[PDB]
RNA sequence: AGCCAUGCAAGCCCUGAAACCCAUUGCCUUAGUGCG
DNA sequence: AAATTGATGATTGCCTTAGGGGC
DNA sequence: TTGCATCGAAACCAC
DNA sequence: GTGGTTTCGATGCAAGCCCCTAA
DNA sequence: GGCAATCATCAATTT
């Protein structure tokens, strides 16, 4: 039994299509059902995953990009795209609780940075006590991430031992990438992260064009590489020096060779994160420093 | 003694042109010195304001738009702009403490909205405890704004009596506009606020074109009129209904007539705010009479 | 008096061969001046 | 006299793109 | 796909 | 038995652009 | 016109 859902929070908007008729509300969960949606939240879908009722999702751009060629008709388009382009739809899986702690950590940190910048701009005690409370929340949730990482083998067995990696690098890298059966090649992970290349051209933001990578992992990798640089970490600092020397003959100012070296190291680190996680979880393979 | 300063926070970047040579640092404050700058912070200008040293500032776009016709040379360009078009330069004045409380209030409110929206998207004990702390801060600063408004004649003598006006509406309107002596006509305030009309076209944001109005006062005015609409406030609700009815024959949907009526009411309210603030401060009058003002 | 269409923010999503090809962001403050 | 919290040294440059659309 | 922008009045609460 | 704090009702609509640049 | 992105090391502080 396939059902296509045009999701919403407001029950007036919701619609479901069985391929023949339209329904206004969802059933009780059962593993006879496969659900397909254009990005339904885990808030609504977790009851189904919790009983083995599969949920498949596709990008919020998939229908808009089919339309280059009422709302309730869009449930029919979602159903039609599941029939015509079943390669797009990917299985939603229930998250680990680390991803929640890391989310709340970054939700506190942006409030902390936001508050620090105002303390730079002019000084008042109200924001200084707030800054202290927000710093405590950020600290306690870093300690929560630190605690939860004990349940994450790729940290305790590997990322813990790399000099210049600690709880926040690993908390972000884990939760932003997630289950490593989602990426059947290293290049799928680079493409998802924003490190792929077409004809020698990088992925850049461009107004009026939807992006197709999770840019937060490329922003995160920037800080992982920044740490490798400042700590002079093992294999990875050597690779930075080697590339930064190799590339400066080819580019017009030092900062371009720097950005190219950073990109090179971030890509090779993601290759190693892939390799180690695939070997840990028992997925197919196709050097990291500490891993043997 | 005129000095043109290309201001900065880091003293390595600071540059001043005295009309003959480039200097790296400012002199001791004296009313003999007139400073001209492109948006210098109050942090750096306040020592001069307290000693009567006039500080004149111009829009950060004035030089960029003049160039349409070393890096330290910009200190000279400011000097050149002050010499050729001194009308672009306006006297900076030390802000009232109300503006600080309102700024901190809006900083807390935006953190509250941000946190409540996260609570809507996901529920966690961490953010609920935080949401309660942030709400407390917003509440205490609302009381701080409310308390500071006692020192503002335009509040206690006029805006306080209008149904639908309280401490946040009035605090925002006062601090966003600042001194009303900056606008010699109601049309100047409409232009600065974003309500002016050119050959029948309104001011709209536009990629690649620097705006020339303080859009935050137009966003605030939207809430002032929204308050009048929900409360059915006297003169202003009548004006809203009358204009929305007069305009609906000329537009294709109810929402467009609504936006035109809202704009009309906002402009009339700003005209009354201008008039009352001018009379309270003792400035010249010009030109519906305000409701509670006599 | 006519002419006349305020924004801010949150959540989530994204899928090039392991050479070579190869330029991450998120914020903060402040400014802005129609006609008779 | 150990666990927790604080401080601050580690390096690295200085374009444009201002910047994703969508649910 | 969402929630927010404010005040005025009725009710609840503590001391 | 008052001063202060909480909850909630009022009213209006479903474009169009997301759409400021500068110090 | 500004800041932040985090980890490692040495030390100070409370308990
Ligand atoms: Mg939909
Ligand atoms: Mg978040
Ligand atoms: Mg400058
Ligand atoms: Mg602010």
Author numbering:
A (entry chain A): 6 to 74, 86 to 302, 317 to 322
B (entry chain B): 6 to 74, 86 to 303, 316 to 322
What does the paper say about this structure?
TasR can be reprogrammed for precise DNA cleavage, including in human cells.
The cryo-EM density shows clear discontinuity at the expected cleavage position on both target DNA strands, consistent with the cryo-EM reconstruction capturing a product state, and each TasR RuvC domain active site is positioned in close proximity to each nick, with four highly conserved acidic residues located near the catalytic magnesium ion. The 18-bp target sequence itself is unwound, whereas all flanking sequences are fully base-paired in canonical B-form helices that do not form any base-specific interactions with the TasR protein or tigRNA, consistent with the lack of a targeting motif. All 9 nt of the spacer A-complementary strand are paired with tigRNA spacer A, forming an A-form helix, whereas the non-complementary strand is single stranded and is separated from its complementary strand by a ‘wedge loop’ insertion domain of the TasR protein. The minor groove of the tigRNA/DNA duplex rests on the TasR coiled-coil dimerization domain, and notably, the two base pairs that we identified as the ‘seed’ region make the closest interactions with the coiled coil, suggesting that the coiled-coil domain could increase fidelity by probing for correct helix geometry at the seed positions. The 36-nt tigRNA forms a pseudosymmetric figure-eight shape as it interacts with both TasR protomers and both DNA target strands. Once accounting for the pseudosymmetry, we observed that the edge repeat interacts with the Nop domain of one TasR protomer, whereas the loop repeat makes almost identical interactions with the other protomer.
